[PDB]
Enzyme design. Structure first.
Site, PDB file in Angstrom:
ATOM      1  CG  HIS A  62      -1.669  -1.222   1.519  1.00 37.83           C
ATOM      2  ND1 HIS A  62      -1.812  -1.641   2.825  1.00 37.83           N
ATOM      3  CD2 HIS A  62      -2.219  -2.196   0.750  1.00 37.83           C
ATOM      4  CE1 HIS A  62      -2.422  -2.815   2.846  1.00 37.83           C
ATOM      5  NE2 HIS A  62      -2.680  -3.172   1.601  1.00 37.83           N
ATOM      6  CG  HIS A  92       0.786   7.664   4.707  1.00 30.83           C
ATOM      7  ND1 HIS A  92       0.147   7.874   5.909  1.00 30.83           N
ATOM      8  CD2 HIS A  92      -0.163   7.824   3.752  1.00 30.83           C
ATOM      9  CE1 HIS A  92      -1.125   8.153   5.650  1.00 30.83           C
ATOM     10  NE2 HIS A  92      -1.350   8.129   4.354  1.00 30.83           N
ATOM     11  CG  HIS A  94      -1.831   8.583  -0.611  1.00 28.73           C
ATOM     12  ND1 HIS A  94      -2.571   7.440  -0.422  1.00 28.73           N
ATOM     13  CD2 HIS A  94      -1.798   9.186   0.606  1.00 28.73           C
ATOM     14  CE1 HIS A  94      -2.965   7.386   0.882  1.00 28.73           C
ATOM     15  NE2 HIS A  94      -2.533   8.421   1.587  1.00 28.73           N
ATOM     16  CD  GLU A 104      -5.390   9.105  -1.093  1.00 31.74           C
ATOM     17  OE1 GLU A 104      -5.374   9.441   0.102  1.00 31.74           O
ATOM     18  OE2 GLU A 104      -5.778   7.987  -1.467  1.00 31.74           O
ATOM     19  CG  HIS A 117      -2.293  11.563   3.590  1.00 28.93           C
ATOM     20  ND1 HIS A 117      -2.990  10.424   3.190  1.00 28.93           N
ATOM     21  CD2 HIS A 117      -2.654  12.611   2.805  1.00 28.93           C
ATOM     22  CE1 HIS A 117      -3.750  10.823   2.187  1.00 28.93           C
ATOM     23  NE2 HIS A 117      -3.578  12.133   1.917  1.00 28.93           N
ATOM     24  CB  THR A 196      -7.944   8.080   1.476  1.00 26.64           C
ATOM     25  OG1 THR A 196      -6.564   7.969   1.833  1.00 26.64           O
ATOM     26  CG2 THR A 196      -8.430   9.524   1.709  1.00 26.64           C
ATOM     27  CB  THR A 197      -6.334   3.151   3.036  1.00 27.87           C
ATOM     28  OG1 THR A 197      -6.010   3.590   4.359  1.00 27.87           O
ATOM     29  CG2 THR A 197      -5.471   3.907   2.063  1.00 27.87           C
TER      30      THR A 197
END
Ligand SMILES: NS(=O)(=O)c1ccc(C(=O)NCc2c(F)cc(F)cc2F)cc1
Ligand SMILES: [Hg+2]
Ligand SMILES: [Zn+2]
Length: 258
Positions: A62, A92, A94, A104, A117, A196-197
């Site tokens: 991920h 982390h 994305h 995102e 994030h 968002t996950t």
């Protein structure tokens, strides 16, 4: 068998195991600058990362997480649309397989190359586990990354990625200063949302910074070299680990600036 971002277990499939995927306060969302409400009652952000103590970095499949010691109010976020003290627990990114995609949240439909994030939890709840059962348990500081000049403060993160290439690998990561990843201005948009996950819990106050930070092509190229798979498994590159924008429903996005 477990969610991912691929054709067969991607975002479009998540609702099967996580019904909340179709909830009313899901993230990410598109930020239509012309419809955001300038709210002058919004207080300034108070970022206090001076006593910050990073511990390690791990590839969890991920994405990759840099973890912080949150046993004491060392690194905190307060002010803004927040009520109470929130502790930094991890951060982390994305990103995408190309520079025109990766973030995102989008701005007027515009997607950036990546998004940082910074995850915090409401201290009144005692531990992160309890914070996820509350409407205001988490606060995530979102920062957009655009491709251009190299960002100094990001380089130590980049130099250690080679040691956490595959799923499950972690590397000791001490004495990292998060303040090196903040833009000059702290102007923001805020709205009630969710993770968002999976599990996609709707327990997050989102604070998206207006000003993006610059990172070089080489810096971003290195994120793209990570792996979704563990060691010994067939190789699948870790790119495009982002969820597309969700419907705003009955929500309003406030701006702390005019
Ligand atoms: N891309 S994002 O910023 O929205 C995001 C931030 C954090 C997490 C997370 O900490 N895992 C879940 C998690 C949970 F759902 C409950 C808990 F108590 C601990 C956890 F780690 C997931 C997504
Ligand atoms: Hg909750
Ligand atoms: Zn995240």
């Amino acid at each position: 068998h477990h969610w991912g971002y691929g054709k067969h277990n991607g975002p479009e499939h998540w609702h099967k195991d996580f019904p909340i995927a179709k909830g009313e306060r899901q993230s990410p969302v598109d930020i239509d600058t012309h419809t955001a409400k300038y709210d002058p009652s919004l207080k300034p952000l108070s970022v206090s990362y001076d006593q910050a103590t990073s511990l390690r970095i791990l590839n969890n499949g991920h994405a990759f997480n840099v973890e912080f010691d949150d046993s004491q109010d060392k690194a905190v976020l307060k002010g803004g649309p927040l009520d109470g003290t929130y502790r930094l627990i991890q951060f982390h990114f994305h990103w995408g397989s190309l520079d025109g995609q990766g973030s995102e949240h989008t701005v007027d439909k515009k997607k950036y190359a990546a998004e940082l994030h910074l995850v915090h939890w409401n201290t009144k709840y005692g531990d992160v586990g309890k914070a996820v059962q509350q409407p205001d348990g988490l606060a995530v500081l979102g920062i957009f990354l655009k491709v251009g000049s190299a960002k100094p403060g990001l380089q130590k993160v980049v130099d250690v990625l080679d040691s956490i290439k595959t799923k499950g690998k972690s590397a000791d990561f001490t004495n990292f200063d998060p303040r090196g990843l903040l833009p000059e201005s702290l102007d923001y948009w805020t709205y009630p949302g969710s993770l968002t996950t999976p599990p996609l819990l709707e327990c997050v106050t989102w604070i998206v910074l207006k000003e993006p930070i610059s990172v070089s092509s080489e810096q971003v190229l290195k994120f793209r070299k990570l792996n979704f798979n563990g060691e010994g498994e067939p190789e699948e590159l870790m790119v495009d680990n982002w969820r597309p924008a969700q419907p705003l429903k009955n929500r309003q996005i406030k701006a702390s600036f005019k």
